Design an enzyme around this catalytic site. Structure first.
Site, PDB file in Angstrom:
ATOM      1  N   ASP A   1     -49.419  29.975 -17.169  1.00  0.00           N
ATOM      2  CA  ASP A   1     -49.666  29.134 -18.358  1.00  0.00           C
ATOM      3  C   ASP A   1     -48.356  28.469 -18.841  1.00  0.00           C
ATOM      4  O   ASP A   1     -48.152  27.333 -19.156  1.00  0.00           O
ATOM      5  CB  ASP A   1     -49.906  30.120 -19.507  1.00  0.00           C
ATOM      6  CG  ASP A   1     -50.591  29.069 -20.879  1.00  0.00           C
ATOM      7  OD1 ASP A   1     -50.944  27.847 -20.495  1.00  0.00           O
ATOM      8  OD2 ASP A   1     -50.634  29.699 -21.887  1.00  0.00           O
TER       9      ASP A   1
ATOM     10  N   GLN B   1     -35.214  24.675 -26.505  1.00  0.00           N
ATOM     11  CA  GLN B   1     -35.725  24.941 -25.053  1.00  0.00           C
ATOM     12  C   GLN B   1     -34.804  26.021 -24.601  1.00  0.00           C
ATOM     13  O   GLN B   1     -35.069  26.981 -23.929  1.00  0.00           O
ATOM     14  CB  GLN B   1     -35.352  23.732 -23.878  1.00  0.00           C
ATOM     15  CG  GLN B   1     -36.527  22.634 -24.195  1.00  0.00           C
ATOM     16  CD  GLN B   1     -37.653  23.197 -23.915  1.00  0.00           C
ATOM     17  OE1 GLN B   1     -38.260  23.176 -22.535  1.00  0.00           O
ATOM     18  NE2 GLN B   1     -38.723  23.639 -25.100  1.00  0.00           N
TER      19      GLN B   1
ATOM     20  N   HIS C   1     -52.165  19.729 -23.656  1.00  0.00           N
ATOM     21  CA  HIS C   1     -53.188  20.617 -23.536  1.00  0.00           C
ATOM     22  C   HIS C   1     -54.466  19.908 -22.748  1.00  0.00           C
ATOM     23  O   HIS C   1     -55.891  20.062 -23.518  1.00  0.00           O
ATOM     24  CB  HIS C   1     -53.509  21.640 -24.376  1.00  0.00           C
ATOM     25  CG  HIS C   1     -52.654  22.533 -24.890  1.00  0.00           C
ATOM     26  ND1 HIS C   1     -51.729  22.450 -25.935  1.00  0.00           N
ATOM     27  CD2 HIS C   1     -52.257  23.836 -24.165  1.00  0.00           C
ATOM     28  CE1 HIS C   1     -50.776  23.595 -26.086  1.00  0.00           C
ATOM     29  NE2 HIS C   1     -51.101  24.187 -24.911  1.00  0.00           N
TER      30      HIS C   1
ATOM     31  N   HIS D   1     -52.735  20.153 -17.561  1.00  0.00           N
ATOM     32  CA  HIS D   1     -52.347  21.555 -17.677  1.00  0.00           C
ATOM     33  C   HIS D   1     -53.364  22.563 -16.971  1.00  0.00           C
ATOM     34  O   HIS D   1     -52.612  23.503 -16.339  1.00  0.00           O
ATOM     35  CB  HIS D   1     -52.320  21.489 -19.065  1.00  0.00           C
ATOM     36  CG  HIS D   1     -51.617  22.891 -19.392  1.00  0.00           C
ATOM     37  ND1 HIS D   1     -50.643  23.648 -19.067  1.00  0.00           N
ATOM     38  CD2 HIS D   1     -52.427  24.039 -20.169  1.00  0.00           C
ATOM     39  CE1 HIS D   1     -50.381  24.830 -19.769  1.00  0.00           C
ATOM     40  NE2 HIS D   1     -51.916  25.080 -20.284  1.00  0.00           N
TER      41      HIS D   1
ATOM     42  N   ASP E   1     -57.719  26.532 -21.445  1.00  0.00           N
ATOM     43  CA  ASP E   1     -57.639  25.931 -22.402  1.00  0.00           C
ATOM     44  C   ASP E   1     -58.722  24.674 -22.601  1.00  0.00           C
ATOM     45  O   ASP E   1     -58.360  23.770 -23.464  1.00  0.00           O
ATOM     46  CB  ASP E   1     -56.158  24.943 -22.467  1.00  0.00           C
ATOM     47  CG  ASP E   1     -54.899  25.816 -22.769  1.00  0.00           C
ATOM     48  OD1 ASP E   1     -55.187  26.660 -24.044  1.00  0.00           O
ATOM     49  OD2 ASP E   1     -53.805  25.542 -22.254  1.00  0.00           O
TER      50      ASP E   1
HETATM   51  C1  4LP Z   1     -39.482  25.657 -27.916  1.00  0.00           C
HETATM   52  O1  4LP Z   1     -39.895  25.359 -26.909  1.00  0.00           O
HETATM   53  C2  4LP Z   1     -41.013  25.816 -26.563  1.00  0.00           C
HETATM   54  C3  4LP Z   1     -42.040  26.451 -27.291  1.00  0.00           C
HETATM   55  N1  4LP Z   1     -42.964  27.227 -27.102  1.00  0.00           N
HETATM   56  C4  4LP Z   1     -43.836  28.018 -28.076  1.00  0.00           C
HETATM   57  C5  4LP Z   1     -45.133  27.610 -28.098  1.00  0.00           C
HETATM   58  C6  4LP Z   1     -45.915  28.128 -28.944  1.00  0.00           C
HETATM   59  C7  4LP Z   1     -45.338  29.024 -29.902  1.00  0.00           C
HETATM   60  C8  4LP Z   1     -43.929  29.610 -29.640  1.00  0.00           C
HETATM   61  C9  4LP Z   1     -43.336  28.673 -28.779  1.00  0.00           C
HETATM   62  F1  4LP Z   1     -41.945  29.109 -28.640  1.00  0.00           F
HETATM   63  C10 4LP Z   1     -43.660  30.616 -30.525  1.00  0.00           C
HETATM   64  C11 4LP Z   1     -42.527  29.965 -31.882  1.00  0.00           C
HETATM   65  C12 4LP Z   1     -43.021  31.814 -30.041  1.00  0.00           C
HETATM   66  C13 4LP Z   1     -44.893  30.855 -31.392  1.00  0.00           C
HETATM   67  O2  4LP Z   1     -45.060  31.919 -32.245  1.00  0.00           O
HETATM   68  N2  4LP Z   1     -45.849  30.047 -30.832  1.00  0.00           N
HETATM   69  C14 4LP Z   1     -47.353  30.208 -31.072  1.00  0.00           C
HETATM   70  C15 4LP Z   1     -47.831  31.107 -30.232  1.00  0.00           C
HETATM   71  C16 4LP Z   1     -47.598  32.592 -30.511  1.00  0.00           C
HETATM   72  C17 4LP Z   1     -48.793  31.944 -30.557  1.00  0.00           C
HETATM   73  N3  4LP Z   1     -43.660  26.847 -25.678  1.00  0.00           N
HETATM   74  C18 4LP Z   1     -43.050  26.380 -25.025  1.00  0.00           C
HETATM   75  C19 4LP Z   1     -44.074  26.087 -23.715  1.00  0.00           C
HETATM   76  C20 4LP Z   1     -43.080  25.990 -22.496  1.00  0.00           C
HETATM   77  C21 4LP Z   1     -44.234  25.819 -21.289  1.00  0.00           C
HETATM   78  N4  4LP Z   1     -45.329  26.130 -22.175  1.00  0.00           N
HETATM   79  N5  4LP Z   1     -45.236  26.117 -23.503  1.00  0.00           N
HETATM   80  C22 4LP Z   1     -46.048  26.163 -24.524  1.00  0.00           C
HETATM   81  C23 4LP Z   1     -46.554  24.975 -24.970  1.00  0.00           C
HETATM   82  C24 4LP Z   1     -47.485  25.169 -25.888  1.00  0.00           C
HETATM   83  C25 4LP Z   1     -48.231  26.065 -26.557  1.00  0.00           C
HETATM   84  C26 4LP Z   1     -47.740  27.289 -25.729  1.00  0.00           C
HETATM   85  C27 4LP Z   1     -46.746  27.287 -24.784  1.00  0.00           C
HETATM   86  C28 4LP Z   1     -41.768  25.638 -25.185  1.00  0.00           C
HETATM   87  O3  4LP Z   1     -41.159  24.831 -24.295  1.00  0.00           O
HETATM   88 MG    MG Z   2     -53.952  28.280 -24.603  1.00  0.00          MG
HETATM   89 ZN    ZN Z   3     -52.275  26.729 -21.771  1.00  0.00          ZN
END
Ligand code: 4LP
Ligand code: MG
Ligand code: ZN
Length: 315
Positions: A220, A272, A71, A75, A110
């Site tokens: 995002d 993933q 972040h 990004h 961010d």
């Molecule tokens: C598993 O791999 C991945 C998992 N996440 C992911 C992230 C958060 C959360 C969840 C996620 F799955 C869940 C579990 C749904 C969850 O509750 N949150 C918190 C958020 C609700 C408030 N993001 C990416 C990704 C691919 C590209 N950008 N991002 C990303 C990376 C960091 C933050 C947000 C998005 C990724 O590659």
């Molecule tokens: Mg954010």
């Molecule tokens: Zn972001």
């Protein structure tokens, strides 16, 4: 630093490449601020912002991204570029104030991220969570945006009218809050329903806000829409940040959830695949339905999904 930015010219060899959704800013770090100036100028006009104020603003934004693994400033610019490509490919749909607001919102969305999820902050009664009970970091990001705007020589919106000023700030506020992924699931579901019942109406401000919210999610998440070697490397940065949060939990002797546990590393390819299927594909599918010119994002997301399948299957 900001004065040399005023002089920057994008190398001509990048003029066509930058228009593509899959463009990767990765190899061009010293150009990132100039790339944002370029995108603003092409999308909003060169007369849109006073150049000096814009340059000061961009440099203050850059300085207020922390040195975290994902972040970070990279990004910010990556998300801003995806928005640029969306706006450029949907030239009739958005107002001049929206194009301005959304490019700025993306660069700022961010700001001052610490590498921690909202869940983390709430669980440990961090002051930011005491202040902002829901969408904790996102409210902070908007707060940081306003603080930067109110710095001397930084109000890029100074030459809008009173009414136009509050309007753009509300566009920015709603767009930044929409980047809370917890809010996306409900937003996408409502949009899908409105689309298939044919009630979606872009003359309706609340429908517009919903579409803008989905665009924000799509931007995002756009690391999943790059060419495979780029996407694969960015996944490294994402998990580095997930695992650092997990490590912080382990400092209290607390076992983190699998996604944030570096000892659960072998599960990443399956993780993933799950994420693409549950989150990314639906996002870009709904976006493509509403805005057909965004189709290349969905196409790229599908390509990367098949790459993760190959990894799982050892191909
Ligand atoms: C598993 O791999 C991945 C998992 N996440 C992911 C992230 C958060 C959360 C969840 C996620 F799955 C869940 C579990 C749904 C969850 O509750 N949150 C918190 C958020 C609700 C408030 N993001 C990416 C990704 C691919 C590209 N950008 N991002 C990303 C990376 C960091 C933050 C947000 C998005 C990724 O590659
Ligand atoms: Mg954010
Ligand atoms: Zn972001």
């Amino acid at each position: 630093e900001w004065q040399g930015l005023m002089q920057f010219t994008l190398p001509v060899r990048l003029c066509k490449e930058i228009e593509l959704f899959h463009f990767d800013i990765g190899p061009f770090e010293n150009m990132w601020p100039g790339i944002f100036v370029y995108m603003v100028h092409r999308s909003c006009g060169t007369s849109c912002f006073e150049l000096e104020k814009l340059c000061r603003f961009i440099m203050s934004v850059k300085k207020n991204y922390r040195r975290v693994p994902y972040h970070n400033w990279k990004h910010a610019v990556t998300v801003a570029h995806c928005m640029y490509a969306i706006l450029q490919n949907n030239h009739t749909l958005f107002t001049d104030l929206e194009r301005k607001g959304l490019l700025i919102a993306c660069l700022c969305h961010d700001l001052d991220h610490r590498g921690f999820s909202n869940s983390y902050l709430q669980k440990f009664d961090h002051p930011l969570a005491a202040l902002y009970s829901t969408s904790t970091m996102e409210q902070h990001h908007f707060s940081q945006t306003v603080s930067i705007l109110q710095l001397e020589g930084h109000n890029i919106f100074s030459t809008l009218s009173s009414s136009e000023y509050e309007q753009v700030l509300e566009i920015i506020r709603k767009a930044i809050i929409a980047t809370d992924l917890a809010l996306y699931f409900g937003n996408r579901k409502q949009l899908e329903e409105m689309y298939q019942t044919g009630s979606l109406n872009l003359n309706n401000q609340s429908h517009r806000d919903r579409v803008i919210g989905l665009m924000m999610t799509a931007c995002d998440l756009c690391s999943v829409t790059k060419l495979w070697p780029v996407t694969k490397l960015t996944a490294n940065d994402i998990y580095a940040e997930f695992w650092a949060e997990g490590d912080e939990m382990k400092k209290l002797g607390i076992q983190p959830i699998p996604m944030m546990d570096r000892d659960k590393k072998d599960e990443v390819p399956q993780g993933q695949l799950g994420f693409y299927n549950a989150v990314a594909i639906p996002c870009y599918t709904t976006l493509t339905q509403i805005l057909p010119p965004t189709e290349p994002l969905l196409k790229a997301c599908r390509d990367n999904l098949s790459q993760w399948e190959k990894v799982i299957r050892g191909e």
